[PDB]
Design a protein around this ligand. Sequence first.
Ligand code: A1A3Y
Length: 93
Amino acid sequence: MPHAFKPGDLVFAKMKGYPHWPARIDDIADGAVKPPPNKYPIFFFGTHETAFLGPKDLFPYDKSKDKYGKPNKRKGFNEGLWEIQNNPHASYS
Ligand SMILES: CC1(C)CCCN1CCN
């Protein structure tokens, strides 16, 4: 059975006005700004943006990839698909 989300988990994350986007639950670096209560730091592959989301917008990658893991015209999306499949735990600093 599922656990809670933890850093390193791979997801498609949903933001208003955007397709479900390949992303990961990030760690918070020492000294870094912490998310709000009940939110996780989401790192979006491809665009390398960060946003803070709750579980309602987080779809586990393995379950969801057949639905959401297809090319998109949006900027950074296909680069994002490559990263989540090929090196999802790399430094993209
Ligand atoms: C990838 C994502 C949907 C995350 C938040 C902003 N961004 C789109 C705008 N560049």
